[PDB]
């Protein structure tokens, strides 16, 4: 009859929905996000993170003579285990921490406190997001921010050039980017890392006096000090990003320096520490600690998400080099291009654990010098069993099933929201551009699906959307700007 024909036509459509996108909630693994959050604790020498496993709660109820209280409203939950090994001269103890985490029911929703809550994907920027006077890469702990300023610079001839100087806005201070590099690599080592050793040279004043005048007009030279001079190649001078590097170097060198101090790493360590601390005698300790924190900035998750050659993602220094070398290109990138953006689901669910862990790290490292073992035990003990569940619900990251329909493919299953706990999108920010549509949206996002109350904040994902495998739920394998 008619019904059989209708089923036959539906099966022969030739336009088929991506089952993997619809069912990605089931195929997403909590452990992938849990592991880096736990490894943030590894900064403490005693704490070493062994592993994590999500296990079903499997306890048969047994009659207890003692009084037992059961809530009428029921929550279906699962247990996550985080196993850590504390090894120190004091003792060796293994800490296993149990946390309650919501469990998926029917492959797309959660049931907590007697209510049906559905998780919805969030739209976020992948990395290297532009900001006023700055370029920022987001990290789990401290975002790495490059802040820019415009300053006058004077040539050996007396020629005045206006150049941009980039400072890392980190650890609550704006510190020139090159000195961070000098503190670990060294001046010659930093030049070798950037590969600018041959092009840019430092010479003494007398060497400048004997040097050929023609070369001086051919290659730009700058006066670091009365006795110290810096010469730069003309072709290197042409590029504006290379000018950024040179201007940062000029800011690095104050006039009251000797050539010997330039070639000593500990001088740069002292300057790096001096930015942060008023006391001038503890500069080295502060500087080395800052280098360590700088190395802590980059986490494995940001490395996996980042979409550039692995040589540039090896360490924090490689990332800073990549950003500075391509600063001009990266600042000029479209915020709304879906190539420069991604969707995430489980990350923000596990994010509050990072806040709790970070509070614990601050407590053990900075509060007191008392016996560490009990304190690092307190870090895990301080977290309550339902911390994740309570934060997920009370902070209202999750969405109640206000559905009036059995139709769920677009109302809940494939719904995305730009608004989030950490949201570039805000009503006060007047993100009228963000509320609009962009040509990249075609084939990935719904052009006409949004809510009149908050237009552009929420929308429906395309049923045919293909998220590239091995791109970590990124719309495109590569960002907007090729950089090659």
């Amino acid at each position: 009859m008619i019904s059989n024909f209708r089923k036959f036509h539906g099966n022969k459509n030739q336009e088929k929905f991506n089952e993997n996108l619809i069912l990605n909630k089931e195929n997403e693994s909590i452990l992938n996000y849990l592991d880096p959050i736990c490894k943030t604790l590894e900064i403490i020498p005693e704490i070493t993170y062994l592993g994590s496993s999500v296990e079903p709660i499997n306890k048969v109820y047994k009659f207890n003579k003692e009084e037992k209280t059961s809530d009428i409203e029921r929550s279906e939950l699962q247990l996550i285990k985080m196993s850590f090994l504390i090894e120190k001269d004091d003792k060796k103890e293994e800490i296993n921490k149990f946390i309650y985490f919501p469990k998926l029911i029917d492959s797309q929703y959660f049931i907590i406190n007697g209510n049906r809550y559905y998780p919805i994907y969030q739209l976020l920027d992948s990395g290297t997001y532009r900001t006023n006077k700055a370029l920022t890469l987001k990290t789990l702990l401290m975002p790495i921010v490059l802040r820019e300023k415009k300053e006058t610079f004077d040539d050996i001839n007396g020629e005045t050039h206006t150049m941009l100087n980039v400072d890392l806005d980190l650890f609550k201070s704006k510190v020139p980017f090159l000195i961070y590099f000098f503190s670990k690599f060294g001046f010659e080592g930093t030049l070798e890392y950037f590969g600018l050793q041959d092009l840019i040279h430092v010479l003494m004043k007398e060497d400048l006096d004997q040097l050929d005048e023609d070369e001086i007009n051919d290659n730009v030279i700058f006066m670091i000090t009365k006795n110290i001079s810096l010469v730069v190649d003309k072709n290197f001078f042409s590029n504006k990003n290379n000018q950024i590097i040179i201007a940062t170097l000029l800011n690095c060198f104050n006039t009251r320096i000797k050539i010997d101090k330039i070639y000593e790493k500990d001088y740069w360590v002292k300057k790096l520490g001096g930015y942060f601390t008023t006391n001038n005698s503890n500069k080295q300790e502060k500087g080395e600690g800052i280098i360590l924190s700088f190395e802590r900035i980059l986490d494995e998750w940001t490395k996996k998400i980042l979409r550039t050659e692995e040589k540039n993602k090896e360490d924090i220094y490689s990332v800073v080099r990549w950003m500075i070398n391509n600063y001009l290109a990266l600042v000029k990138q479209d915020n709304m291009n879906l190539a420069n953006k991604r969707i995430r689901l489980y990350e923000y669910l596990l994010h509050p654990l990072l806040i709790k862990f970070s509070k614990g790290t601050y407590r053990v490292l900075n509060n007191r010098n008392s016996n560490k073992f009990e304190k690092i035990k307190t870090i895990f003990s301080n977290i309550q069993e339902g911390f994740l569940v309570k934060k997920i619900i009370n902070n209202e990251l999750l969405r109640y099933d206000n559905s009036v329909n059995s139709i769920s493919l677009f109302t809940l299953i494939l719904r995305y929201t730009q608004s989030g706990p950490q949201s570039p999108f805000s009503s006060n920010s007047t993100n009228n551009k963000l509320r609009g549509l962009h040509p990249s949206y075609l084939g990935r996002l719904g052009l006409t699906s949004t809510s009149a109350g908050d237009p552009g904040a929420s929308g429906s994902l395309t049923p045919f959307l293909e998220l590239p495998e091995n791109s970590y739920m990124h719309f495109t394998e590569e960002p907007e700007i090729n950089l090659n």
Binding site: F17, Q108, V404, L447
Partner: protein, 640 residues
């Protein structure tokens, strides 16, 4: 971005990848973006329909939407075998099954209704799961229970097809207003399911609203509908020691808390923190006791049956079975103190699940897939609606009449194309019925479809040639009487001005219908229609002098939230230039308690048909408090 040169049509040609919710909308290229976004909003606002039908004009993605929206159907995920069946109520029951591969023991739950939120819910077609008995194998992809949206072959429908004509009906179809046939309104029917909690503490008792003197029943039974919109009413007592209030069972008072809903209750869940012996002595608890016992009887029944499986060492149990078993075991176990909102409660808390068939009523909002909106202004008998006369299609009556004025202004032309296609299809169906063999019928069908959709024509030729002669005759009769499927893809494959023009030129016999009392000839063609969530009940407020949230807690029939008068309203009223009367209304209605008491008393003691109120001139209580406190402050007004 500013640049749209990146968008090239050849790249997206033949693909609906750029469409999302509009995959359910035919001829989406012809509809404006505003109407499309309204349609996307309507689909989420759409309510389930008992008699939902697959659209006559379809996009062919509807079944996929039914497939991947799992809230409407339950599909087995493995081969299973039915170990046993346990009953809590006639309507609610549980089926224990064993995986034929894993050996794991799992359960499936059957209930009449699905609750979503507020009053929204839908009834279940539980035919297959009810058919299953012990030692019956459940195949891998069997659908145990389905929503009314899905049909016998699991086709998906969110609305009903209604014959529509654009006609000006006595100006009742003004702006976006619709007149519907009573039979047609019967088709557009929704369910309402409500979970209502009545909490009765030690000093509270439930009045004998549903029971006689010999048998005390204070609330409806599992198979009985609610009467007078009152489930039960609780009277709180200062001391329950006397039990002198036995004679008070029939009467009701304002102090009593009444719980309001209408429908058939289908499940009762009672959470009791009182020992059984304390409950048994009082006859007024008798009805409650039965259901309490029933719950225990159900729980114990599962415990005895599954104890070997759960508490055995193998423990091949699903997490759902384990938690169900643990909860029932907690229920039967002693020293189980139930807590609600993290507090131990006296007496017991009852949850009623109530399912009611809610019909279409005036003020309901219905729409099509093209962003149009309509409000049901009038429901009229079938005879009063436009009926064509003196034709082969004689006596055909229009189910719905829509406003003709402004149709093109809406910028949603596609509704008209749907209407024209179903109207031309009526002629094709009558042509098939009137004459020919089965071969002639398929020839006419294939030609018309070749005019509309080539892919449908090709697939229909394959499907028809597959059919046996008896099956072919049955399919043809289905097409003649029930309707003809027509495929109008959202962007690629829909017909246009030229194709409809050719269709009209070829089929010269097809012309407007001459209706019984209408000078202008009319076109009557089926349009797919959906029912929206909005009803007037949501915003109704009415208040009489003596938010409270009682209405949200089901303690009030309707909201009594007061209306607010502000400076703008006072100015518009001051247009009259009679400020004294405005102040009199303000004092009598709100500000002045003495004047308010005078108004109420005079309204109830004066002549019913002549009302003249004289209000005393007195300072308001707020003013008195202000003067007292200000004098203590040390400042006094001088009538500045």
């Amino acid at each position: 971005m500013d640049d749209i040169s990146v968008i090239k049509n050849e790249d997206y040609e033949g693909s609906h990848r750029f469409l999302a919710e509009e995959l359910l909308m035919p001829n989406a290229n012809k509809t404006d973006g505003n109407r499309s976004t309204m349609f996307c909003s309507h689909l989420a606002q759409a309510v389930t329909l008992q008699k939902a039908e697959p659209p006559l004009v379809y996009t062919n993605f509807e079944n996929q939407v039914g497939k991947y929206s799992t809230a409407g159907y339950r599909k087995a995920n493995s081969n299973y075998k039915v170990i046993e069946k346990i009953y809590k109520n006639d309507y609610n029951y549980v089926l224990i099954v064993q995986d034929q591969e894993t050996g794991e023991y799992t359960l499936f739950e059957r209930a009449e209704c699905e609750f979503l939120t507020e009053h929204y819910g839908f009834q279940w077609d539980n035919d297959k799961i009810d058919s299953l008995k012990k030692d019956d194998t459940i195949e891998k992809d069997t659908v145990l229970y389905k929503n009314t949206c899905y049909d016998e072959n699991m086709n998906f429908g969110y609305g009903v097809n209604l014959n529509a004509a654009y006609f000006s009906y006595k100006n009742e179809t003004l702006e976006d207003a619709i007149v519907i046939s009573e039979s047609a309104a019967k088709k557009l029917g929704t369910f309402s399911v409500n979970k209502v909690k009545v909490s009765v503490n030690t000093n509270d008792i439930l009045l004998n609203l549903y029971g006689d003197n010999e048998n005390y029943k204070g609330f409806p039974d599992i198979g009985e509908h609610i009467k007078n919109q009152i489930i039960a009413s609780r009277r709180r007592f200062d001391y329950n020691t006397a039990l002198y209030e036995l004679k008070n069972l029939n009467e009701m008072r304002d102090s009593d808390t009444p719980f309001f809903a209408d429908g058939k209750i289908v499940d009762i869940e009672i959470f009791s923190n009182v020992p059984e012996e304390e409950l048994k002595v009082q006859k007024y608890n008798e009805q409650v006791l039965y259901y309490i016992n029933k719950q225990k009887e159900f729980s114990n029944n599962v415990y005895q049956k599954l104890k070997k499986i759960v508490e055995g060492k193998d423990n091949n149990v699903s997490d759902k079975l384990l938690h169900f078993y643990n909860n029932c075991k907690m229920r039967i176990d002693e020293n189980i103190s139930y807590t609600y909102q993290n507090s131990k409660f006296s007496g017991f808390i009852m949850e009623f699940t109530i399912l009611e068939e809610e019909p279409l009523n005036k003020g309901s909002k219905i729409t099509g897939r093209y962003g149009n909106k309509g409000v049901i202004s009038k429901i009229l008998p079938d005879d009063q609606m436009p009926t064509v006369a003196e034709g082969r299609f004689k006596g055909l009556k229009a189910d719905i009449c829509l406003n003709p004025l402004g149709v093109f202004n809406r910028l949603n032309p596609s509704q008209l194309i749907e209407q024209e296609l179903n109207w031309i299809a009526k002629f094709i169906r009558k042509d098939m019925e009137e004459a020919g063999s089965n071969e002639e019928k398929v020839s006419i069908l294939l030609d018309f479809l070749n005019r509309v959709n080539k892919e449908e024509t090709e697939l229909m030729e394959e499907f028809i040639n597959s059919l046996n002669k008896t099956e072919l005759e049955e399919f043809l009769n289905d097409i003649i009487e029930n309707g003809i499927p027509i495929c109008q893809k959202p962007f690629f494959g829909n017909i246009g001005l030229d194709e409809l023009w050719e269709l009209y030129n070829h089929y010269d016999h097809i012309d407007y219908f001459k209706c019984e009392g209408i000078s202008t000839p009319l076109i009557i063609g089926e349009i797919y229609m959906v029912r929206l969530k909005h009803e007037p009940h949501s915003k109704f407020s009415a208040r009489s002098t003596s938010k409270s949230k009682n209405f949200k807690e089901h303690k009030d029939l309707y909201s009594k939230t007061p209306v607010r008068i502000g400076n703008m309203e006072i100015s518009n009223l001051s247009l009259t230039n009679e400020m004294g009367s405005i102040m009199d209304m303000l004092n009598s209605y709100s500000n002045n308690e003495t004047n308010r008491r005078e108004l109420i008393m005079q309204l109830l003691t004066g002549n019913p048909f002549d009302t003249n109120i004289d209000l005393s001139d007195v300072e308001s209580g707020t003013s008195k408090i202000l003067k007292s406190l200000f004098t203590c402050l040390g400042l006094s007004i001088d009538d500045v």
